[PDB]
């Protein structure tokens, strides 16, 4: 209703003592659409509400606190120390009590195979991120198979994020060869080592059911089942009203009114490092391959008005996002969007000193009309951005054709392949913000869906990643963001308010923000 959409230092999870909850209960919570691939390290399996479901089942090196703090996961590992200084040799010592769903233990080769799979030196894997695997010289077995030292070639200060935050560990049987990587898990997940496993991949009713791990090694969960039912945005809040799901996210004003206007449902809020944006395709063949055209159409989109309309009633004084690397709340955030300040008169001036002249309702050059295709998910909140953007762009004679796609194969079919002129989607980060640089904003980045880039950006990114002291690294990242802004790369629209709607009787599970869940603690009300 009234707060700030900035990254904070506390979470709203409805903490209760794990013991004083129930010992069962079904967690019904929805999903965008049935995942096409279950390898989160793959380009089409890399998704937010796929990794979120897979968080429970797979290992993870570090527990991330409410403010970005890091503690070793004593339940999966025992000792993760940074031994050597100039070439960093971080030593991952695995628990002897960690097994995989199939019974094969976890060991050094399980980590080596993953680090080589996302290393990027073999192009057969269709990876989605190469976070730190391209800066590691080699992975050597420690004194025991459990132990596994990792020698770093180039200095990587953000080494805690390989198997923490967004990324987790996967069995070597799924990362050993490209066949199992790319084509291994299109019908169901492989081995897993978490408190919960998936047991029912019902595609006739469009439901995924997660149940407890028989081989679980930590404190056994209070819950018993977690069923995901895929469900479009149109009917997701009515599903909550009529008691078919338990927790969702609130995106618009109505979604927020009909969650506290009803009884039994409580609304939690804790913002995180997530944001929406317009992604522009500069790949040769796109009407927007012209840098000057991108920079002249960026001035014709009012981002302040878009933010104010988009988050109205969710955040007091809604303001847009003005940084690609950081978000409001993280250290080292500032306004770098002075080059793209909204000025529709200057847009017309340098759009007629570029060639498209206003002959009719929309401009045309050499015969082709100035029309741009917009690709977005057909939801209630996402299309408002499109409508405001097209209304504002019509004021300078630019046609924005809206194409609202479904949830199935939105990325794998349209975004990863280049079938768009402008794209609408969001990024979900973690306590580790400098990992997005190579992944997205590098010229050869694995998530550079628009193929926009320049050598200067790459050199700047290398300069930031080659520096250890955070104070200078933050300023260098800010400089890289200025370079990105003066390129027509993309337009960050809004941050995330982080308001989820949960049933009031559900505990240890809400909006976490910068922290992560303890899946062995989520329980239900003991009436």
């Amino acid at each position: 209703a009234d707060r700030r959409a900035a990254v904070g230092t506390t979470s709203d999870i409805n903490q209760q003592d794990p013991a004083t909850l129930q010992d069962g209960g079904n967690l019904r919570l929805s999903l965008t659409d049935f995942p096409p691939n279950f390898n989160i390290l793959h380009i089409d399996g890399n998704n937010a509400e796929v990794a979120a479901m897979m968080k429970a089942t797979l290992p993870r090196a570090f527990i991330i606190g409410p403010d970005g703090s890091t503690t070793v996961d004593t339940n999966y590992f025992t000792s993760i120390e940074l031994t050597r200084t100039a070439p960093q040799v971080v030593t991952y010592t695995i628990n002897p009590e960690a097994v995989w769903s199939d019974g094969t233990p976890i060991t050094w080769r399980d980590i080596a195979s993953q680090i080589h799979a996302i290393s990027g030196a073999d192009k057969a894997f269709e990876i989605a991120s190469s976070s730190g695997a391209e800066r590691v010289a080699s992975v050597t077995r420690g004194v025991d198979d459990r132990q596994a030292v990792v020698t770093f070639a180039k200095p990587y200060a953000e080494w805690r994020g390989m198997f923490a935050g967004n990324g987790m560990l996967l069995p070597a049987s799924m990362t050993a060869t490209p066949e199992a990587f790319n084509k291994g898990q299109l019908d169901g997940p492989g081995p897993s080592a978490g408190p919960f496993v998936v047991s029912a991949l019902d595609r006739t009713a469009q439901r995924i059911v997660l149940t407890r791990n028989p081989r679980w090694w930590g404190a056994r969960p209070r819950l018993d089942s977690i069923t995901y039912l895929v469900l479009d945005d149109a009917a997701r809040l009515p599903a909550l009203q009529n008691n078919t799901i338990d927790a969702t996210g609130v995106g618009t004003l109505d979604q927020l009114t009909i969650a506290a206007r009803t009884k039994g449902i409580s609304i939690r809020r804790a913002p995180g490092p997530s944001w929406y944006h317009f992604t522009l395709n500069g790949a040769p063949g796109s009407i927007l391959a012209d840098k000057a055209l991108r920079l002249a159409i960026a001035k014709g989109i009012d981002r302040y008005t878009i933010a104010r309309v988009a988050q109205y009633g969710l955040t007091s004084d809604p303001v847009p996002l003005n940084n690609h690397v950081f978000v409001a709340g993280q250290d080292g955030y500032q306004d770098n969007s002075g080059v793209v300040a909204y000025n529709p008169e200057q847009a017309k001036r340098e759009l007629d000193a570029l060639g498209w002249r206003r002959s009719g309702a929309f401009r045309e050059k050499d015969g082709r009309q100035l029309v741009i295709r917009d690709l977005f998910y057909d939801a209630q909140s996402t299309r408002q951005f499109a409508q405001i953007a097209q209304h504002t762009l019509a004021q300078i004679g630019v046609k924005l054709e809206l194409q609202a796609k479904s949830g199935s194969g939105f990325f794998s079919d349209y975004v990863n392949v280049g079938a768009f002129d402008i794209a609408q989607f969001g990024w979900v980060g973690d306590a580790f913000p400098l990992s997005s640089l190579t992944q997205i904003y590098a010229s050869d980045g694995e998530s550079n869906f628009g193929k926009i880039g320049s050598p200067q950006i790459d050199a700047a990114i290398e300069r930031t990643l080659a520096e250890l002291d955070p104070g200078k690294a933050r300023a260098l990242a800010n400089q890289v963001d200025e370079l990105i802004w003066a390129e027509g790369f993309s337009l960050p629209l809004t941050q995330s308010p982080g308001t989820v709607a949960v049933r009031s009787t559900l505990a240890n599970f809400g909006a976490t923000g910068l922290a992560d869940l303890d899946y062995t603690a989520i329980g239900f009300m003991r009436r």
Binding site: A234, T305, Q380, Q384, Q387
Partner: protein
């Protein structure tokens, strides 16, 4: 000596049915108002008020605003413009096609009639809405509504042509027309005085339900994302947008839906009244 005519004998019977007269008056007032009102309102269509978001009815926006800050009165007037013009044009053209097919089929007779009705049966196999939705991929992002009007009309004449021919065929094998020939009436005068009065009023009462059918088809198409596109509005698009907020801010869904239901009620009432006036005691 003061014998009244026949055309002025049917109009008086329509006038003495106040329900149909009121329904016709309401329809005509709506159609004229959809074009007269917009240059009176304090806020034009297609322009957004960004500090008047989701406001209730009042003194700047009388019918309230929208999730995007649009006046819900100007928007619904424009949507009504499009949704009614489409229906009227489609009804007229489809009635013309139905007449010019059923009349020729029923007058020719024989094998010509047999094949011309077998073709209609064939066109009736697959439900019309899905046949039209199949061709919406084209004519979807065009400016003029001409293609949509033609598409809706080309799949809306079959059922009414069935009855047009079914009554032409049975009327030409009658006895009063034979008596008319026995008197000295010409072949064309027989048609003008006996057939045209029969199938010129069945068409009239058919093109009052054609309007309702065309409007239903158009809103059903524009509701699913086909038909009419985002920058411009229709009644179906307005209802589709407003579904998700009826519970909390009901003015954004109750109003366009109530307008559409009122238009359809008036159309059906007019059809019933015209049928009762042109066919007095059935």
């Amino acid at each position: 000596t003061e014998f009244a005519s026949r055309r002025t004998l049917v109009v008086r019977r329509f006038l003495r049915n106040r329900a149909a007269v009121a329904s016709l008056a309401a329809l005509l007032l709506l159609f004229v108002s959809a074009y007269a009102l917009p240059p009176l309102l304090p806020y034009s269509y297609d322009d957004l008020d960004f500090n008047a978001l989701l406001q209730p009815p009042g003194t700047k926006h009388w019918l309230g605003t929208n999730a995007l800050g649009q006046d819900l009165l100007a928007q619904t007037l424009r949507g009504m413009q499009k949704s009614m013009l489409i229906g009227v044009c489609v009804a007229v053209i489809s009635t013309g096609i139905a007449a010019t097919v059923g009349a020729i089929s029923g007058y020719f007779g024989g094998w010509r009639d047999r094949t011309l009705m077998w073709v209609v049966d064939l066109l009736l196999v697959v439900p019309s809405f899905i046949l039209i939705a199949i061709v919406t991929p084209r004519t979807k992002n065009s400016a003029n509504i001409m293609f949509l009007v033609l598409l809706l009309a080309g799949f809306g004449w079959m059922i009414s042509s069935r009855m047009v021919r079914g009554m032409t065929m049975s009327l030409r094998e009658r006895e009063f027309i034979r008596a008319a020939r026995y008197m000295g009436v010409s072949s064309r005068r027989i048609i003008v005085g006996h057939v045209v009065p029969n199938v010129a009023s069945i068409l009239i009462i058919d093109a009052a339900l054609n309007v309702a059918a065309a409007i239903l088809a158009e809103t059903g198409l524009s509701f699913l994302g086909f038909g009419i596109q985002p920058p411009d509005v229709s009644l179906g698009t307005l209802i589709a947008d407003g579904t998700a907020s009826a519970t909390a801010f009901p003015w954004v869904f109750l109003f366009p839906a109530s307008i559409l239901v009122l238009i359809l009620v008036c159309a059906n009432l007019t059809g019933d009244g015209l049928r009762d006036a042109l066919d007095p005691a059935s």
